[PDB]
């Protein structure tokens, strides 16, 4: 996969190489620090909603482990030779991000459905279709980025197919949010709507990073992509988790869970 991504085409100045490295290690540090927060506040969440915060812990460790792996692969694959960082070993590719999305995107989608108060049949059926759509999005996206060096037309076709799953997924999410916000407690019917708009904005940065090879095929585009991934990661995983957890606690408290009431 390393020969198929644009990162393998370029030499990097020390500044470019260090910035990328620092983005990845900063992301590791943010995810594992939020992990502790989610772990600690899980005691303030009613049993009904506690799985939602537990899923955030899983997202944090999953996302953090891959960012840590990328950071090490990044420094293993390049060496400072004659004033630049040059490819030494085929060990870095973005594909690990995609495979990980197969795991974390279901987790992120499940926490939302839980705080929406969906139960039994509807929860299982709704989650099945959302996870199938998300996997379809990720799988077609993954195949497309295998062509970002050798076939930009193929990257566009796979991306268009991926974007159809994305659109259908967002329609299911949005429909369930607007049809069920009336069941939300503690005033969180107003909060869940913002989470939906946060999702739209944060998730849409990923297709933009996907397209960098088409509009910025150079070492600065490599940096920009990692920057957009970092903003998208923090927003779609951390800030999103913080809001899901807020909703979990507020509804727990409204539902008469004392640890939630004593903590608010």
Ligand X SMILES: *C\C=C(C)/C=C/C=C(C)/C=C/C1=C(C)CCCC1(C)C
Ligand Y SMILES: CCCCCCCC/C=C\CCCCCCCC(=O)OC[C@H](O)CO
- Contact residues toward ligand OLA (CB under 6 A) are 25, 28-29, 32-33, 36, 51, 68, 71-72, 75, 110, 123-124, 127-128, 131-132, 136, 153-154, 156-157, 159-161, 163, 207, 210-211
Query: In this chain, which residue has its C-beta nearest to ligand Y?
Result: 174
Pairwise CA distance, residues 79 & 162, whole Å:
35
Residues between 187 and 216 with contacts to ligand X, criterion CB under 6 A: 203, 206-207, 210
CB of residue 147 vs ligand OLA: minimum separation in angstroms?
A: 9
- The answer to whether the beta carbons of residues 237 and 108 sit under 8 Å apart is yes
Is there binding between residue 237 and ligand X (CB under 6 A)? Answer: yes
> Interface with ligand Y includes 81 (CB under 6 A)?
no
101 binds, among ligand OLA, Cl ion, ligand Y, none (CB under 5 to 8 A by kind): Cl ion
Instruction: Specify the residue, 163 or 193, whose C-beta has the smaller distance to ligand X.
Output: 163
Q: Which residues of 47-74 are buried (b: 16+ CB within 10 A; e: fewer)?
A: ebbbbbbbbbbbbbebbbebbbebbebb
Residue nearest to Cl ion (CB): 104
Q: In the structure encoding, which two tokens stand for residue 244, read together?
A: 């899901």
Nearer to ligand Y, 119 or 179 (CB): 179
Q: Which residues pair with 79 in a beta bridge?
A: 86
**Binding at 125: pick from Cl ion, ligand OLA, ligand Y, none (beta carbon under 5-8 Å per type):** ligand Y
CA gap 156, 151 in Å, rounded:
9
Q: Is 259 in the site for ligand Y (CB under 6 A)?
A: no
Residue 131 interacts, among ligand Y, ligand OLA, Cl ion, none and using kind-specific CB cut-offs from 5 to 8 Å, with ligand OLA
29-58 positions binding ligand X, by CB under 6 A: none
Measured CA to CA, the distance from residue 261 to residue 249 in angstroms comes to 8
Task: Name the residues that contact Cl ion, by CB under 5 A.
Answer: 63, 100-101, 104-105
Backbone angles phi and psi of 79, in degrees to 5: -135, 145
Binding mask 118-137 for ligand Y (x = CB under 6 A): -------xx--x--------
| Residue 86, φ and ψ in degrees, nearest 5 | -120, 150
Neighbours of 120 (CB within 10 A): 7
- Minimum distance from CB of 212 to ligand Y (Å)? 18
Binding residues for ligand X (CB under 6 A): 101, 104-105, 108, 137-138, 141, 159, 162-163, 166, 203, 206-207, 210, 236-237
* Residue ranges that bind ligand Y, judged by CB under 6 A: 125-126, 129, 160, 163-164, 167-168, 170-172, 174-175, 178-179
């Amino acid at each position: 996969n390393s020969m198929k991504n644009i990162e393998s085409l370029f030499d990097y100045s020390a500044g470019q190489f260090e910035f990328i490295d620092h983005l990845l290690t900063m992301g590791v540090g943010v995810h594992f620090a939020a992990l502790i927060f989610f772990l600690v506040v899980s005691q303030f969440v009613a049993p009904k909603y506690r799985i939602a915060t537990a899923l955030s812990c899983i997202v944090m460790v999953s996302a953090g482990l891959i960012l840590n792996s990328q950071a090490v692969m990044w420094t293993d694959a390049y060496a400072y030779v004659d004033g630049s960082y040059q490819l030494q070993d085929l060990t870095f590719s973005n594909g690990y991000r995609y495979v990980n999305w197969m795991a974390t995107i279901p987790c992120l989608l499940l926490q939302l459905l839980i705080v929406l108060n969906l139960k039994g049949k509807e929860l299982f059926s709704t989650a099945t279709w959302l996870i199938l759509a998300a996997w379809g999005m990720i799988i077609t996206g993954y195949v497309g980025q295998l062509y970002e060096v050798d076939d930009i037309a193929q990257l566009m076709i796979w991306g268009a197919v991926s974007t159809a799953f994305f659109v259908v997924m967002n329609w299911i999410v949005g429909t369930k949010i607007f049809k069920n916000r009336a069941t939300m407690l503690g005033g969180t019917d107003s909060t869940i709507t913002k989470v939906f708009w946060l999702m739209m904005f944060a998730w849409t940065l990923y297709p933009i990073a996907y397209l960098v090879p088409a509009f910025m095929n150079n070492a600065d585009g490599v940096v920009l992509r990692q920057l957009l991934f970092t903003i998208a990661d923090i927003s779609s995983k951390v800030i999103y988790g913080l809001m899901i957890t807020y909703i979990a606690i507020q509804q727990s408290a409204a539902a008469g869970y004392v640890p939630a009431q004593q903590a608010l």
